[PDB]
Design a protein around this motif. Sequence first.
Motif, PDB file in Angstrom:
ATOM      1  N   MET A 247       0.836  -1.217   0.000  1.00 23.56           N
ATOM      2  CA  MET A 247       0.000   0.000   0.000  1.00 23.56           C
ATOM      3  C   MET A 247       0.858   1.250   0.000  1.00 23.56           C
ATOM      4  SD  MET A 247      -2.985  -1.006   2.750  1.00 23.56           S
ATOM      5  CE  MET A 247      -4.136  -2.341   2.431  1.00 23.56           C
ATOM      6  N   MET A 248       1.161   1.763  -1.176  1.00 31.19           N
ATOM      7  CA  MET A 248       1.902   2.992  -1.304  1.00 31.19           C
ATOM      8  C   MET A 248       1.075   4.010  -2.078  1.00 31.19           C
ATOM      9  SD  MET A 248       4.749   1.732  -4.110  1.00 31.19           S
ATOM     10  CE  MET A 248       5.299   3.387  -4.497  1.00 31.19           C
ATOM     11  N   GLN A 249       0.974   5.207  -1.540  1.00 34.17           N
ATOM     12  CA  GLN A 249       0.216   6.267  -2.173  1.00 34.17           C
ATOM     13  C   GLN A 249       1.032   6.903  -3.283  1.00 34.17           C
ATOM     14  OE1 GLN A 249      -2.223   9.560   0.049  1.00 34.17           O
ATOM     15  NE2 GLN A 249      -0.403  10.555  -0.773  1.00 34.17           N
ATOM     16  N   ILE A 250       0.396   7.132  -4.408  1.00 32.43           N
ATOM     17  CA  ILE A 250       1.057   7.721  -5.543  1.00 32.43           C
ATOM     18  C   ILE A 250       0.524   9.116  -5.809  1.00 32.43           C
ATOM     19  CG2 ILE A 250       1.413   7.574  -8.047  1.00 32.43           C
ATOM     20  CD1 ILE A 250       3.078   5.589  -6.509  1.00 32.43           C
ATOM     21  N   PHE A 251       1.433  10.046  -5.923  1.00 28.00           N
ATOM     22  CA  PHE A 251       1.107  11.408  -6.240  1.00 28.00           C
ATOM     23  C   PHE A 251       1.339  11.605  -7.733  1.00 28.00           C
ATOM     24  CE2 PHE A 251       1.757  15.848  -6.775  1.00 28.00           C
ATOM     25  CZ  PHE A 251       1.488  16.561  -5.625  1.00 28.00           C
ATOM     26  N   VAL A 252       0.279  11.704  -8.498  1.00 25.99           N
ATOM     27  CA  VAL A 252       0.407  11.937  -9.922  1.00 25.99           C
ATOM     28  C   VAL A 252       0.175  13.398 -10.208  1.00 25.99           C
ATOM     29  CG1 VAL A 252      -0.310  11.172 -12.232  1.00 25.99           C
ATOM     30  CG2 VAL A 252      -0.598   9.643 -10.269  1.00 25.99           C
ATOM     31  N   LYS A 253       0.846  13.925 -11.202  1.00 26.26           N
ATOM     32  CA  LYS A 253       0.718  15.312 -11.539  1.00 26.26           C
ATOM     33  C   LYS A 253       0.703  15.437 -13.052  1.00 26.26           C
ATOM     34  CE  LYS A 253       4.325  17.779 -10.722  1.00 26.26           C
ATOM     35  NZ  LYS A 253       5.371  18.419  -9.888  1.00 26.26           N
ATOM     36  N   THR A 254      -0.480  15.642 -13.609  1.00 27.93           N
ATOM     37  CA  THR A 254      -0.651  15.746 -15.041  1.00 27.93           C
ATOM     38  C   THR A 254      -0.114  17.068 -15.595  1.00 27.93           C
ATOM     39  OG1 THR A 254      -2.922  16.512 -14.631  1.00 27.93           O
ATOM     40  CG2 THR A 254      -2.614  14.170 -15.119  1.00 27.93           C
ATOM     41  N   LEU A 255      -0.332  17.299 -16.894  1.00 28.08           N
ATOM     42  CA  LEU A 255       0.160  18.495 -17.581  1.00 28.08           C
ATOM     43  C   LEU A 255      -0.405  19.783 -16.995  1.00 28.08           C
ATOM     44  CD1 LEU A 255      -0.047  17.270 -21.281  1.00 28.08           C
ATOM     45  CD2 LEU A 255       1.859  17.112 -19.671  1.00 28.08           C
ATOM     46  N   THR A 256      -1.525  19.690 -16.312  1.00 26.63           N
ATOM     47  CA  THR A 256      -2.130  20.862 -15.729  1.00 26.63           C
ATOM     48  C   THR A 256      -1.528  21.150 -14.373  1.00 26.63           C
ATOM     49  OG1 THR A 256      -4.005  19.370 -15.253  1.00 26.63           O
ATOM     50  CG2 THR A 256      -4.329  21.091 -16.918  1.00 26.63           C
ATOM     51  N   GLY A 257      -0.757  20.197 -13.871  1.00 23.99           N
ATOM     52  CA  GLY A 257      -0.139  20.365 -12.591  1.00 23.99           C
ATOM     53  C   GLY A 257      -1.079  20.008 -11.475  1.00 23.99           C
ATOM     54  N   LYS A 258      -2.011  19.106 -11.753  1.00 27.67           N
ATOM     55  CA  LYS A 258      -3.025  18.749 -10.793  1.00 27.67           C
ATOM     56  C   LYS A 258      -2.610  17.494 -10.046  1.00 27.67           C
ATOM     57  CE  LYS A 258      -6.436  20.535 -10.559  1.00 27.67           C
ATOM     58  NZ  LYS A 258      -7.613  20.156 -11.384  1.00 27.67           N
ATOM     59  N   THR A 259      -2.734  17.537  -8.742  1.00 34.06           N
ATOM     60  CA  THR A 259      -2.397  16.415  -7.894  1.00 34.06           C
ATOM     61  C   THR A 259      -3.476  15.328  -7.945  1.00 34.06           C
ATOM     62  OG1 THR A 259      -1.238  17.919  -6.375  1.00 34.06           O
ATOM     63  CG2 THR A 259      -1.847  15.729  -5.528  1.00 34.06           C
ATOM     64  N   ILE A 260      -3.174  14.214  -8.598  1.00 39.45           N
ATOM     65  CA  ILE A 260      -4.088  13.088  -8.613  1.00 39.45           C
ATOM     66  C   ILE A 260      -3.641  12.069  -7.559  1.00 39.45           C
ATOM     67  CG2 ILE A 260      -5.419  11.589 -10.142  1.00 39.45           C
ATOM     68  CD1 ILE A 260      -5.186  14.391 -11.234  1.00 39.45           C
ATOM     69  N   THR A 261      -4.438  11.954  -6.526  1.00 45.04           N
ATOM     70  CA  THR A 261      -4.102  11.095  -5.399  1.00 45.04           C
ATOM     71  C   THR A 261      -4.780   9.717  -5.456  1.00 45.04           C
ATOM     72  OG1 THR A 261      -3.925  13.110  -4.047  1.00 45.04           O
ATOM     73  CG2 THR A 261      -3.911  10.992  -2.890  1.00 45.04           C
ATOM     74  N   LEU A 262      -3.996   8.688  -5.803  1.00 46.90           N
ATOM     75  CA  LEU A 262      -4.452   7.294  -5.746  1.00 46.90           C
ATOM     76  C   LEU A 262      -3.444   6.460  -4.964  1.00 46.90           C
ATOM     77  CD1 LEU A 262      -7.110   6.992  -7.244  1.00 46.90           C
ATOM     78  CD2 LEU A 262      -5.627   8.545  -8.531  1.00 46.90           C
ATOM     79  N   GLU A 263      -3.862   5.306  -4.488  1.00 44.03           N
ATOM     80  CA  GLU A 263      -2.962   4.415  -3.771  1.00 44.03           C
ATOM     81  C   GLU A 263      -2.870   3.077  -4.498  1.00 44.03           C
ATOM     82  OE1 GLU A 263      -3.934   2.834   0.314  1.00 44.03           O
ATOM     83  OE2 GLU A 263      -2.095   3.909   0.817  1.00 44.03           O
ATOM     84  N   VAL A 264      -1.697   2.466  -4.474  1.00 41.51           N
ATOM     85  CA  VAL A 264      -1.458   1.216  -5.192  1.00 41.51           C
ATOM     86  C   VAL A 264      -0.558   0.301  -4.375  1.00 41.51           C
ATOM     87  CG1 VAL A 264      -1.762   2.173  -7.526  1.00 41.51           C
ATOM     88  CG2 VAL A 264       0.488   2.233  -6.439  1.00 41.51           C
ATOM     89  N   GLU A 265      -0.183  -0.819  -4.952  1.00 42.19           N
ATOM     90  CA  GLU A 265       0.668  -1.766  -4.273  1.00 42.19           C
ATOM     91  C   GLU A 265       2.121  -1.593  -4.720  1.00 42.19           C
ATOM     92  OE1 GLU A 265       0.096  -4.451  -1.515  1.00 42.19           O
ATOM     93  OE2 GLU A 265       1.886  -3.222  -1.822  1.00 42.19           O
ATOM     94  N   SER A 266       3.039  -1.725  -3.777  1.00 38.49           N
ATOM     95  CA  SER A 266       4.464  -1.575  -4.052  1.00 38.49           C
ATOM     96  C   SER A 266       4.940  -2.713  -4.951  1.00 38.49           C
ATOM     97  CB  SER A 266       5.244  -1.589  -2.737  1.00 38.49           C
ATOM     98  OG  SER A 266       4.618  -0.762  -1.762  1.00 38.49           O
ATOM     99  N   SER A 267       4.295  -3.846  -4.795  1.00 39.98           N
ATOM    100  CA  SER A 267       4.611  -5.038  -5.546  1.00 39.98           C
ATOM    101  C   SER A 267       3.845  -5.093  -6.881  1.00 39.98           C
ATOM    102  CB  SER A 267       4.271  -6.255  -4.696  1.00 39.98           C
ATOM    103  OG  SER A 267       4.718  -6.072  -3.358  1.00 39.98           O
ATOM    104  N   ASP A 268       3.231  -3.977  -7.275  1.00 45.06           N
ATOM    105  CA  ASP A 268       2.490  -3.920  -8.538  1.00 45.06           C
ATOM    106  C   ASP A 268       3.461  -3.576  -9.663  1.00 45.06           C
ATOM    107  OD1 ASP A 268       0.339  -3.616 -10.487  1.00 45.06           O
ATOM    108  OD2 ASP A 268      -0.970  -3.116  -8.812  1.00 45.06           O
ATOM    109  N   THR A 269       3.037  -3.713 -10.904  1.00 41.98           N
ATOM    110  CA  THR A 269       3.929  -3.456 -12.015  1.00 41.98           C
ATOM    111  C   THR A 269       3.659  -2.111 -12.673  1.00 41.98           C
ATOM    112  OG1 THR A 269       2.536  -4.883 -13.447  1.00 41.98           O
ATOM    113  CG2 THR A 269       4.570  -5.834 -12.547  1.00 41.98           C
ATOM    114  N   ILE A 270       4.748  -1.466 -13.081  1.00 44.13           N
ATOM    115  CA  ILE A 270       4.709  -0.165 -13.756  1.00 44.13           C
ATOM    116  C   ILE A 270       3.602  -0.091 -14.819  1.00 44.13           C
ATOM    117  CG2 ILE A 270       5.954   1.284 -15.413  1.00 44.13           C
ATOM    118  CD1 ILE A 270       6.811   1.662 -12.493  1.00 44.13           C
TER     119      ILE A 270
END
Length: 77
Positions: free
Chosen positions: A1-24
């Motif tokens: 369970m690791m939270q991922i901070f995504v930031k698109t071209l608009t610079g918007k913080t997209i907050t989702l959580e995923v597994e560390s053992s998941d694949t790119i």
Amino acid sequence: MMQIFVKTLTGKTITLEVESSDTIDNVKAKIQDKEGIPPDQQRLIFAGKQLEDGRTLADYNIQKESTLHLVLRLRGG
């Protein structure tokens, strides 16, 4: 369970959580699905680490609070 901070071209913080053992590829498929952008046009960069699609998140040593920036480099023709 690791939270991922995504930031698109608009610079918007997209907050989702995923597994560390998941694949790119699986997480990029989530981004792709969200924005509707093929991997051939968009690539993500986090901590200078390039997405290779196959390696897990732990294979990039860093965990939660990481920031995925969208790099849109295209030309069309």
